[model samples]
Target: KASSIELKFDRNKGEVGDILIGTVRINNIKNFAGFQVNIVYDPKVLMAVDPETGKEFTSSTFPPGRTVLKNNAYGPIQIADNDPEKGILNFALAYSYIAGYKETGVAEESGIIAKIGFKILQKKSTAVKFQDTLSMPGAISGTQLFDWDGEVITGYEVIQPD
Candidate 1:
């Protein structure tokens, strides 16, 4: 009937160079389909998404789909799309694309859309759950959706702590 996205952080605090795990959950879903999650964070936070240095993204629970990781905000591989998304130039960064059941584009599985990975940056707190950085980086947004088109039942759009 409806859907929503939920992002959960593995820890509340971490050290630099540390890999933090995140869980993406979708509620009340039938035949789920493709989705593009846009994750945002602090620009000061490097290693996750460096403009001229590293890649975006670190890991994932899925085999990795049509998603284009951009070193913009970061990724399971080091965000790639250097050009990045338009709108929220600072809020828009790492993004993931997923397509389901070739013919139907419907997902056979339920729960846990993805387990995102984020690299710790500084002595400050890094909320990977997607929020406005009261101090550094910026606002982060992540989440889940259903239907081969684009329909969310529930859940936040997008953390970690370090």
Candidate 2:
């Protein structure tokens, strides 16, 4: 497909054990209500789901019209936890909306696929990036990030904690 997704951060700086948060946005998403966002990180610098959902917010209703994963075993949004050893986080999204689904009003122009939170670990100063490898039809690879369209983007913010 030509459609892809983009990830964005709130800031560009951070500290050890602090929270690094970002959002995944889809571009030219003509169809497909579901997605699978695969994010690979640096285990030495950042940890994913090491404990209780890290510091991220898995949505239930920031988006009123559609449905997303709530960290449930059997739902639209589901996470494969984090492979701290492998520095990988597998997150699958399905919006939970069927074809021809209708809401009271129109949806937002920017399609937010996901909002993620991970813990920053103690490591040498390095530029954070995601792996970019196409393993399957929608396999997630870390690189500067893709999925909602063709070569979408994944951005990040820094957390300078004391």
Candidate 3:
């Protein structure tokens, strides 16, 4: 089967203290369960934050009630590796609404899974890179989109939104 997923920011250029919204979208897929996004930026220029709170991004758009897995250590706690201070946003979330295995659900394609907010730190213009790795600040499974069965979906493209 051939399918693809795309990641993008609502806008690219922003002034110091401005907010940038990055939306993770699924172009075409099936049995969507979870996803991981690893974004790299210049700490001196940008900082991930909560759009509503004006503080670090300790929470994500994914609803906790349905999420079975997430970025608990770094992105959510705002500590250790992958913290905003380290210049990398390593976040992930998966869905699993269940009650004794009687209730379960999966996400549909052609939609958004998360909205990440970042605040500009400096006056210069820079780019955010969607570069996922396996070591240091990365999930043991790395960046991925998951199927209902927890299988890694491949052949997806990472686009740099402008």
lDDT winner? 3
Worst 10 residues of 1 by lDDT: 82-91
Report the Cα lDDT for candidate 2. Answer: 0.45
User: In angstroms, how far off is 37's CA in candidate 2?
Assistant: 2.1
Location of the lowest summed lDDT over 10 successive residues in candidate 2: 60-69
Segments of candidate 3 deviating more than 4 angstroms: 58-81, 97-107, 136-142
Off by over 4 Å in 1: 1-3, 46-109, 130-144, 148-162
TM-score of each: 0.48, 0.55, 0.70
List candidate 2 stretches off by more than 4 Å.
1-4, 49-81, 95-109, 127-162
lDDT of each: 0.40, 0.45, 0.59
Candidate order by TM-score, highest to lowest?
3, 2, 1
* lDDT of each residue in 1-162, candidate 2, tens digit only: 344555566754577777666566655444334545456566677654323346332322122212222323323443343444666555554434432222322322335655555567774554444444554343344322222232433332211221
Tens-digit lDDT string for candidate 1 (1-162): 344555566675668876666555555545454344554555455234322233453332231222222222212222222112221111222222332232434343346545545556677754443333333222224333334333443433222333
Q: What range of 10 consecutive residues in model 3 has the weakest lDDT sum? A: 71-80
lDDT of candidate 3 at residue 68, scale 0 to 100: 29
